[PDB]
Design a protein around this ligand. Sequence first.
Ligand SMILES: CO[C@@H]1[C@H](O)[C@@H](COP(=O)(O)O[P@](=O)([SeH])OP(=O)(O)O)O[C@H]1n1c[n+](C)c2c(=O)[nH]c(N)nc21
Length: 181
Amino acid sequence: NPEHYIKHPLQNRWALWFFKNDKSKTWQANLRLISKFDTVEDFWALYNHIQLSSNLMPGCDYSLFKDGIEPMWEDEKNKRGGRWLITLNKQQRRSDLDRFWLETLLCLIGESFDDYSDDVCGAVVNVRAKGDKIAIWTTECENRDAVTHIGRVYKERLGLPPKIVIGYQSHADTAKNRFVV
Ligand SMILES: CO[C@@H]1[C@H](O)[C@@H](COP(=O)(O)O[P@](=O)([SeH])OP(=O)(O)O)O[C@H]1n1c[n+](C)c2c(=O)[nH]c(N)nc21
């Protein structure tokens, strides 16, 4: 009976990355691979072992990306892409940051965007004194149907009311909203 002893494989293998701001080093040198996983059980083992985003020192990031995609604009799968951005105020560090981030992780590993989950590259949480950010990165900023489907599903999974609007920005511009939902 395979069900009783095999781990549950995920559709993709994922890599978790950590960034710590250190002014001595370049941005790329501050980015480090923590580990990879490709089962539900190994996901939770990693998540349960690491700090909540709300407990990270200001200036740190977590990134969860499909194995083979580095969490940087320069990666072949990100250079023509962009991000759905969730901007948090300082009070939301306490109320929403960790629950939004875990919901974002599950959207990725559970492949929650139907046919368009293949357009997903990964997600990033930035812990910053001026206000935290969470973002889902996708591979092609010109694929309007894929980008807007991901954005609408993401907004509903986060539980954001219609009085909130979230925006999608291309990395080429970051390096202006193209879409809003
Ligand atoms: C070279 O500087 C860039 C960014 O200007 C710098 C800060 O990115 P970042 O840490 O995303 O900005 P925040 O601290 Se949330 O603050 P604002 O976005 O300015 O409100 O971090 C570097 N950086 C940030 N990212 C995401 C990248 C990247 O993908 N590739 C490269 N080459 N650099 C990146």
